[PDB]
Amino acid sequence: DAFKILEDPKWEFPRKNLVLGKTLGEGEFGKVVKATAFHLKGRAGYTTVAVKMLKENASPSELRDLLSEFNVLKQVNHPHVIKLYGACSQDGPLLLIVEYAKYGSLRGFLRESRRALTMGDLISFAWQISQGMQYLAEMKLVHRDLAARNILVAEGRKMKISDFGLSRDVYEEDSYVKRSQGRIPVKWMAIESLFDHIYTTQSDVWSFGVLLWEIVTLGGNPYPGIPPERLFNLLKTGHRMERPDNCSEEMYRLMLQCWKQEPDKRPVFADISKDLEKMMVKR
Numbered sequence: 001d002a003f004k005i006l007e008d009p010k011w012e013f014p015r016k017n018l019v020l021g022k023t024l025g026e027g028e029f030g031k032v033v034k035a036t037a038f039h040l041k042g043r044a045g046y047t048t049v050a051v052k053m054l055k056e057n058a059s060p061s062e063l064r065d066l067l068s069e070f071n072v073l074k075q076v077n078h079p080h081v082i083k084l085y086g087a088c089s090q091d092g093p094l095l096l097i098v099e100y101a102k103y104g105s106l107r108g109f110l111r112e113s114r115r116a117l118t119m120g121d122l123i124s125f126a127w128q129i130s131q132g133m134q135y136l137a138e139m140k141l142v143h144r145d146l147a148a149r150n151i152l153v154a155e156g157r158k159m160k161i162s163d164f165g166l167s168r169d170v171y172e173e174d175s176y177v178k179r180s181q182g183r184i185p186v187k188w189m190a191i192e193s194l195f196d197h198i199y200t201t202q203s204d205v206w207s208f209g210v211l212l213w214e215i216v217t218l219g220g221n222p223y224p225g226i227p228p229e230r231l232f233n234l235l236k237t238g239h240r241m242e243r244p245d246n247c248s249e250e251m252y253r254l255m256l257q258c259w260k261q262e263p264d265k266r267p268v269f270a271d272i273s274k275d276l277e278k279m280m281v282k283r
């Protein structure tokens with residue numbers, strides 16, 4: 001029975017210690033509300049947090065993605081990865097108590113700033129995300145849904161990689177796994193994911209390339225008006241997005257390297273973090 005949730009004493013939090021507040025956002029993803037949690041992870045007072053829960057019209061696959069995000073979050077801990085604090089899994093709706101990111105998504109944050117942001121700010125955002133990705137790749141995780149919509153902006157404009165429900169291990173550990181087919185946005189999928197359903201740390205690098213383009217265009221829309229079929233044929237014949245305005249030559253070069261046809265010819269996240277750090281310190 002996939003509806004039965006086994007309690008994890010390490011993450012269980014009392015429902016009566018949690019004050020549910022205003023809705024931050026609701027969509028296909030579920031429902032996220034702002035909350036105050038009392039006596040969280042041993043501390044004496046209260047903590048402002050975000051709580052994710054199923055929507056009223058949630059389906060079994062939405063519960064499966066919420067449980068999957070919960071189990072991935074239990075394993076990771078990094079300053080540029082959204083932090084799990086606990087959960088209320090018994091005697092009521094499943095609630096995930098997570099780090100609160102006051103600015104919402106990076107896509108909305110960038111779009112709203114069209115708020116003064118410099119190129120330095122943009123490089124620093126990309127660099128923070130690359131450090132998180134680099135740590136996630138050493139944790140043997142393949143994110144699959146890296147995109148500006150799926151990254152949060154917390155206090156002090158700090159990037160927090162989020163949305164771990166579609167995350168996979170680089171080496172599949174289960175004897176039997178039922179894959180939820182075609183869940184990643186077409187425009188953020190690497191060429192090998194589009195043709196062969198292949199998702200590795202190198203396809204996360206291709207998605208990081210699309211994310212770079214989103215950051216540099218302040219939440220722009222990649223490949224405007226190109227249908228999935230034409231997009232796939234264009235990528236197959238070597239066509240890539242042109243250099244957008246307000247993007248340095250060195251930054252566009254890094255994007256092209258992320259979109260190389262051959263996965264092993266793309267840079268690794270450790271190289272990307274050093275590339276972005278040099279770009280930051282040059283100024």
Ligand SMILES: COc1ccc(-c2cnn3c(N)c(-c4ccccc4)c(NC4CCN(C)CC4)nc23)cc1OC
Pocket residue numbers: 024025026029032050051052069082096098099100101102103104105108149150151152162163
């Ligand atoms: C202006 O609007 C917003 C303002 C603040 C937030 C906000 C603050 N903190 N926080 C979290 N901790 C999680 C989150 C992350 C992982 C697990 C559980 C919860 C979360 N989850 C979404 C991430 C984006 N994707 C796309 C869907 C889930 N959203 C927010 C969100 C907003 O808009 C939806």
Ligand SMILES: [Cl-]
Pocket residue numbers: 154155156157
């Ligand atoms: Cl701030």
Ligand SMILES: [Cl-]
Pocket residue numbers: 167168169172173
């Ligand atoms: Cl997996």
